[PDB]
């Protein structure tokens, strides 16, 4: 998945 803080 996307590893940023969402």
């Amino acid at each position, epitope marked *: 998945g*996307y*590893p*940023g*803080q*969402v």
Partner: antibody
Amino acid sequence: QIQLVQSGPEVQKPGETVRISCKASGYTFTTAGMQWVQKMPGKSLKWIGWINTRSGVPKYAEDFKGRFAFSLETSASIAYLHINNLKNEDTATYFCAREGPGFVYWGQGTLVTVSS
Amino acid sequence: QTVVTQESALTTSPGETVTLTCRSSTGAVTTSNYANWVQEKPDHLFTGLIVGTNNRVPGVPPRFSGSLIEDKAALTITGAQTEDEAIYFCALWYSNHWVFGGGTKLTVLG
């Protein structure tokens, strides 16, 4: 209403340091990461990196790591971009933008002008 | 090396549908690129429109929608309004960094 409000345009000499501020409101600051973006005049946008506002850990783009650094003042809901040893090519508008994934809400932009 | 390519400019008329596209140098854009679309108006005023291919940012008019069409990401404005004249940028995620396209200047006639 979510709003990111950045410090006003700034002028510095080559070799000096600048700090760009980004004050967030309208949501819990530590629940979304903060991206930083550069737009040199007349050119496109470059991702500088993000900072995780919960853990305080940054992730940088390779071309900006080093002179560009991120910090926080979490209690104030502020994210900062620090640029040191400024160079002529750093003249640009800098934006904070909230995750995500990517760039959901944008600050108004801060134009940093490096003098001759 | 990784390059995101957008149309430099295109024109529509008010009330028509228009589609802007976003191509990747790595091959097909997929949902793993988390495609974003953002709008720039004067004076360097950026609004987020779409994130994660097709998720419209709250408060953006529903005439804006994101999708994948063939191998590209696409922004469709269904019924473009005069005030939609602006520069539209897409951004794609490539494993460990975001890359922006060069922007499309959308003209709306009239």
